[PDB]
């Protein structure tokens, strides 16, 4: 009985979204000058991890980066000089995600264990120690992100996202809209809203304070592994196993553009935009990262400096360089 | 050149690298194992006999040692029962252990499908699978009982015989041997369907109370590691 109304609403959603399809991103932006060939070189080669690199994040200083490997350790790297700042052993050896707090005081990571523990980088004791453990999830932690030094948002495979308060270590609000494991999460520039992709081949817009789904974007045909917010906050790109990257807009409620190529028949692991947003840097299972023009939707360049699968990729806040982590236990910074 | 504090930073980085080097030796020496199976597969029985923490724990770690050789056996805890995503985490494990209840003829097909999906996974191509046909006592009692027949679920069982390679235990009834080798071979057909020599199957027969599982796993892991070394050397 209720399902009858659901079909009516679903038809209504398509009709309104379709009505706004005034012109594709390709037609409107066809006249812009081509981005051209973008060539990047490995400026710094970071090695030392024992197992595959799974996740990495850049700090607000554009110099320090955190890299996560399934050997059970987090290493803080001085990107400018390759010096190692800290070595944090991990109780759980299968960490799948990591984060770097904007203040540079805390680092969080999680994995197959249902805890995304927070590690304090700056303590008078002189060594990194665990300050809190967040054990509210019933699935593997896939992505944990900070909104403030007291609040961290986490995603896990139990199809539910949670918002935590570090001081009390409890879930202030719970997100349960997805029907599949959540793989990716990224915060807006103002931290007011965040988008996460799951295996249901759909991406949903979430409000931190309201705790409700503002918008949904199916888009893909298979699982979505990565998601990144556009610098202006009005768009976001997604990476999925369907071997195509899709760009979505929170204002138009439609897929702006699809980045794909015939030679690519493998899924995407990570996606990230440059500082200005004109370039989309994404990871692929074929051991190389392809650079896509956000507007022209053409292959600007290819990075093939990794011998194994690339799982993480991120751009500095200043857009000065992009780091690539791969299962070969090496991280390379490109500029 | 380098400033005074830059030299100290480089010294700290070198010390951290040295710390990492020591950790690497343990990592290679330590052997990681993945434990998989249904609820009736009796994974807990193997997990028990550990002669050598959180309610919502997503993964469990089991530590046991044989002949000064450290084995880490991992069992997944609280999860949504979907594996195609987090299974990517176990692409470099030494081996995968799959336990099955030979006794449940109804759930044998489910176990076979689970093994086939794991075997054909694109991320587990280079990882061999160790198969333990647990709870053979129930299988022996059930066959010997005659109340239930495997023919009802596996029609090919009506025209199957124990191969000459069989090595049944003394005093076992021929029906028990036929059923046991029928199961193992049903599993091998999936094992041999697409092995291609990159990974192999190690079937074993286990009971709810058996202390030889540790040595069986030791032998299987040693063989797997030796085969991997031979492949790396190019002699395989």
């Amino acid at each position, epitope marked *: 009985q209720l399902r009858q109304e659901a079909e009516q609403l679903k038809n209504q959603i398509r009709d309104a979204r379709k009505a706004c399809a005034d012109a594709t991103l390709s037609q409107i932006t066809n006249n812009i000058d081509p981005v051209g060939r973008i060539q990047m070189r490995t400026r710094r080669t970071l090695r030392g991890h024992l197992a595959k690199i799974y996740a990495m994040h850049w700090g607000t200083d554009s110099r320090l980066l955190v890299s996560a490997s399934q050997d059970g350790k987090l290493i803080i790297w001085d990107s400018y000089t390759t010096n190692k700042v800290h070595a944090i052993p991990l109780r759980s050896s299968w960490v799948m995600t990591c984060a770097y707090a904007p203040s540079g005081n805390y680092v969080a990571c999680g994995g197959l264990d249902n805890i995304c523990s927070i590690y304090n980088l700056k303590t*008078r004791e*002189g060594n990194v120690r665990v300050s809190r453990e967040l054990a509210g999830h019933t699935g593997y932690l896939s992505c944990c992100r900070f909104l403030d030094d007291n609040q961290i948002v986490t995603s896990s495979g139990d199809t539910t996202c949670a918002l935590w308060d570090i001081e009390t270590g409890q879930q202030t609000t719970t997100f349960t809209g997805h029907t599949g494991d959540v793989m990716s999460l990224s915060l807006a520039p103002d931290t007011r809203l965040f988008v996460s992709g799951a295996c249901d081949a759909s991406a949903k817009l979430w409000d931190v304070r309201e705790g409700m789904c503002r918008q949904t974007f199916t888009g893909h045909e298979s699982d979505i592994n990565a998601i990144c917010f556009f610098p202006n906050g009005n768009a976001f790109a997604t990476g999925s196993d369907d071997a195509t990257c899709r760009l979505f807009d929170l204002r138009a409620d439609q897929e702006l553009m699809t980045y794909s190529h015939d030679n690519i028949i493998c899924g995407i692991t990570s996606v990230s935009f440059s500082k200005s947003g004109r370039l989309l840097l994404a990871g692929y299972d074929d051991f190389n990262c392809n650079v896509w023009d956000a507007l022209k939707a053409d292959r600007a360049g290819v990075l093939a400096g990794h011998d194994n699968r690339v799982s993480c990729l991120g751009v500095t806040d200043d857009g000065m360089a992009v780091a690539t982590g791969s299962w070969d236990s090496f991280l390379k910074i490109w500029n | 050149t380098l*400033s005074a*504090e830059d030299k*100290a930073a480089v010294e*700290r980085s070198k010390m951290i690298e040295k710390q990492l080097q020591k950790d690497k030796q343990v990592y290679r020496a330590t052997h990681r194992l993945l434990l998989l199976g249904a609820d009736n597969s009796g994974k807990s029985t193997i997990v028990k006999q550990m002669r050598i923490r959180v309610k919502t724990s997503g993964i469990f770690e089991t530590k046991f040692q044989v002949d000064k050789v450290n084995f880490h056996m991992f069992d997944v805890g609280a999860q949504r029962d979907e594996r195609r995503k987090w299974i990517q985490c176990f692409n470099d494990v030494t081996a995968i252990i799959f336990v099955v209840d030979s006794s449940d003829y109804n759930r044998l097909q489910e176990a076979l499908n689970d093994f086939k999906s794991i075997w054909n996974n694109r991320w587990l191509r280079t990882i061999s699978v160790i198969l333990f046909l647990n709870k053979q006592d129930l299988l022996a009692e059930k066959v010997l009982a005659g109340k239930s027949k495997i023919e009802d679920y596996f029609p090919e069982f009506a025209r199957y015989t124990t191969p000459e390679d069989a090595t049944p235990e003394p005093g076992e009834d021929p029906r028990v041997t036929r059923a046991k080798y029928f199961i193992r071979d049903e599993f091998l057909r999936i094992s041999t369907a697409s092995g291609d020599g990159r990974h192999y199957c190690y079937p074993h027969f286990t009971c709810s109370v058996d202390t030889e599982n540790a040595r069986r796993i030791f032998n299987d892991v040693t063989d797997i590691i030796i085969k991997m070394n031979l492949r790396d050397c190019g002699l395989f």
Partner: single-chain antibody
Amino acid sequence: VQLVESGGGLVQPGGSRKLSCSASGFAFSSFGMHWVRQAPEKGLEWVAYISSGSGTIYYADTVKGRFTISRDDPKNTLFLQMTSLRSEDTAMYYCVRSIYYYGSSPFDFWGQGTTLTVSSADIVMTQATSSVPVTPGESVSISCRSSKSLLHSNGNTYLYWFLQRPGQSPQLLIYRMSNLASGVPDRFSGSGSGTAFTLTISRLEAEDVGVYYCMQHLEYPLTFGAGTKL
């Protein structure tokens, strides 16, 4: 964080005595230790340094050879063995920890010290103002000069400010000439041009009374200024 050092006493000229410095409450193995001594009526003076891994060791020329530095990381103890003690060696010795990494704060904690009684390429720090009369509520600027610019090519101006309250060990105020150490009031701030430096004490308080010492960390042979007493 706590550092307790012992071994002080009276030694006749030409004698030998051994100092000790035990640490607790923090990872002693991860912090490099420095020896700084103050004469009864003089400022600070660097003595020796031992790295976290005991690899790099440096000594002051005035005590070169005579002083040797050893530590026992398992015992969380830092030693100073001295031989052929001369008259000039009489001073109160403080062991100071240091950890060096990007964004670090070396010389963040100082021990109470131990009194010892005995029966030219280094950068010279100039502090003309021996003392300045100050009153609560006012702002006073302390300026010092260095013979060589401390601004290294990496972009860091290696300057350190230390405040030594009467009856208490020196406490770091500012490091790298811009950053404020944790636990210090925000009203403390400093600046410099690379060779001329200034430390500003806004909203002076009765607790601010003491001697301000400046140090340069560009080169291992550390040198300290004359010191300004407010």
